[PDB]
Every structure is written in C-alpha cells, then in structure tokens.
C-alpha cells in the first residue's frame with residue numbers, strides 16, 4: 001500500500017514483460033516516473049505530486065495492455081511508459097493541463113501524439129471502468145502487488 | 149485534406165472551432181483544431197481527456213465526437229455540427245423564451261447530465277456556451293475539457309473548477325471532494341437564466357461576492373441544514389440572510405412547480421441537491437403539469 005512499494009512492483013512487472021531488454025533495472029522505470037513528478041512540481045505545474053497508490057494502479061492498468069513483450073530498446077520502453085504516464089496525468093491529474101517536455105524522449109514528436117491516439121483508442125473504456133467499478137480497481141490493485 | 153473549412157464558429161485558449169464539410173461524403177461537421185507545436189503549454193492534455201470521455205459518452209443530448217485526426221502539428225476533433233449555443237440563443241430572442249422551450253431545454257440538459265453521472269463522469273463546466281442548440285430544438289451538453297471520471301478514492305479534486313457564476317457554495321468554501329451534486333447546482337443556475345431574461349442568477353466579481361449573492365437570495369444555511377459547512381477549508385462567517393426571500397420576481401416565467409424544481413437544484417448543502425434521475429421524475433416534467 002506504499003507508493004515506493006507499488007512502483008517497485010510496476011518496475012519488476014515491466015522487466016518480466018520486456019524479456020528482450022537485458023540491461024534494464026527495475027529501478028529505471030521508478031527513476032523515470034519520480035523524475036517527471038519532481039520536474040512538474042519544481043516548475044510549479046502542480047502543488048502536490050501525482051504519484052500516489054491509486055494513480056500507480058491506474059498507470060499499471062495501461063502499461064500491462066499497452067506495453068508489448070517485444071519492445072526492442074530501453075529508449076522505446078521509456079517513450080511508451082511516459083506516453084501512458086502523460087495519459088494518466090491528463091485523465092486523473094488535479095491540474096487542468098500538463099506540458100509535454102517532461103514526457104517527450106523522442107526526436108519525432110509526430111510519433112508521441114500518434115501513440116497517445118493509439119492508447120486512447122485501446123484503453124478509453126477501461127480508463128472509465130476502473131473508476132466506475134470498485135471491483136475492477138481491487139482486481140488490478142491485487143494483480144499489481146502479485147508482480148513481485 | 150479530408151475536410152473543407154467553411155467559416156470559424158469561435159476561437160479561445162481551447163483552440164479554434166470551424167464549421168466544415170467532409171470532402172468524401174459532403175456532410176456538415178464542426179472541427180476543433182488543437183495546436184501541438186507549443187511544447188510548454190498543456191492544451192493537448194485537456195484535448196486528450198475530452199477524447200477519452202466523449203468516446204464513452206454516446207447520447208443524443210451530448211455533442212457527438214465522430215473522429216480525431218492527427219495531421220501537420222495539430223489535433224482535429226470532428227464533432228457533429230450545431231446551429232448555435234444557448235448564449236447566442238438568449239441574444240437572438242431578447243432573452244425571452246416560451247415556457248415550453250424553457251421546459252424542453254432543461255429536460256434535454258438533465259437527460260445528457262444524468263447519462264454522464266450514470267457513466268461516472270463529472271462535467272464541471274456547465275454554462276450557456278457549452279449548451280449547443282439546433283433549429284429543431286435539440287440541446288447537447290458540449291465541452292468536456294474540464295470533465296473527469298470519478299469512483300477511485302482520492303484525497304481531493306481541484307477547487308479551481310466551474311466558472312465563478314456557476315460554482316456551488318461547497319466548492320466556493322474550498323470543498324476537497326464533491327460528487328455529481330456539482331453539475332446539479334450549475335443546472336439550477338442555467339434553469340433560472342432560461343426562466344428569466346437569459347441573465348446570470350449569481351454574477352459575482354470574486355468568491356466572497358458570489359457566496360454573498362447566493363445566500364442573499366436562498367438564505368444563509370444553518371447548522372441544521374448544513375452541519376459540516378463551518379468545517380470547510382475556506383469557510384469564513386457570512387451574514388445570516390433570511391430564507392423568506394421570494395423567488396417569484398427572480399424567475400417570473402415559472403409556475404410553483406418550476407420554482408420547486410429550481411429550489412431542489414439550488415440547495416447549498418450538496419447532499420440534499422436533487423439528482424438528474426430524481427429531477428426527470430419531478431412533476432415539472434409530467435404531461436399533467438399545467
């Protein structure tokens with residue numbers, strides 16, 4: 001039920017999913033997420049940090065359906081994870097708006113937005129269901145904790 | 149390429165909105181153009197949320213999102229096209245509506261709003277400009293830029309939600325959490341506009357003026373009516389304004405039935421605010437009603 005504890009599961013989840021990445025650490029996802037939450041906070045784009053137990057469970061719910069087993073590089077995994085994050089902020093974040101710079105790690109911005117549209121077309125329905133159905137939220141909360 | 153622009157409808161922070169024609173099918177749509185090339189402003193953020201929500205909100209009283217195009221350095225949301233908003237309708241008709249049009253618009257608003265709430269979505273930006281009106285009399289709830297899904301336990305939402313004139317007292321008092329009750333207050337404010345000269349019921353300059361203008365008409369709630377009021381984060385003591393102030397001169401288009409619905413929508417204490425579901429069963433909407 002701790003954020004660090006739930007982030008450590010997500011990282012261990014991503015490492016198990018992405019078999020092809022041999023030199024990826026379960027702390028790398030955690031470092032990339034915390035780094036973003038800090039940046040937005042210190043730039044004054046939010047008053048409080050976004051990364052809480054509930055939102056880590058939401059982010060996980062996206063990652064497990066968006067992130068291919070066959071992602072070829074750590075750089076691609078970060079691009080995809082941060083796209084899922086940008087969508088978590090935009091769906092659940094208490095601020096009206098969040099900027100792109102913290103979330104963009106690609107030289108091709110066209111690629112980032114095309115991917116946003118891809119994930120919304122796949123997940124928009126479960127994005128609402130995890131909020132509408134408490135049973136589904138607990139099912140996904142459980143699954144996350146069972147990823148260590 | 150796929151769409152021919154005809155004329156601009158409006159432009160703001162949210163993006164530019166054109167009337168447009170499909171080049172293939174010749175059908176008249178509305179395009180909202182959202183620029184992505186400014187990488188230090190979060191306008192896209194809101195656009196993507198609006199897309200996630202409208203993809204799961206199909207109902208004849210909610211603006212229909214047909215398609216989303218990514219081309220150039222722009223997002224283009226393709227909406228069904230509507231004739232005007234309720235803001236330009238009030239201007240169009242000297243703010244002076246037929247009691248049956250008043251009744252028709254509020255009905256359609258509560259159907260689209262009761263649909264949202266049932267699908268676990270808060271609108272959080274009800275105002276005349278977000279009510280699209282067709283010539284055939286159809287009304288659509290539009291602009292889900294500030295809308296969010298609810299159900300997952302949170303510390304709080306944002307208090308910086310709903311434009312000042314349509315924001316309920318609990319939120320003005322800085323309420324951490326609020327429910328579907330938030331949209332039901334805005335619905336009350338819009339209903340009072342329809343039922344007078346299309347003029348805003350509580351047009352305050354700041355939060356203080358807003359709460360003073362509401363309590364002056366409806367009366368300052370007591371600890372009996374609203375126990376938790378005095379415990380709210382931005383609570384400060386207001387004058388005890390009486391609960392005897394007549395509503396007859398404020399909404400002179402409404403019979404006692406209309407006025408009873410209005411008072412159920414505009415309860416300060418969010419817990420006692422009539423729901424969209426409950427509102428639609430109200431005598432004001434019977435074929436019996438005089």
Ligand SMILES: CN1CCC(N(CC(=O)O)c2ccc3cnc(Nc4ccc(-n5ccc(CO)n5)cc4F)cc3n2)CC1
Nearest residue numbers: 157178180227228229230231232233236277278290291292
């Ligand atoms: C403030 N906020 C801005 C965004 C806007 N929006 C995008 C969205 O909902 O996300 C849409 C979406 C679909 C729309 C379909 N139809 C229209 N039609 C129309 C609306 C007004 C006018 N109009 C008012 C005054 C004047 C001056 O004569 N024209 C003329 C017209 F053709 C708008 C839509 N907006 C909703 C409102």
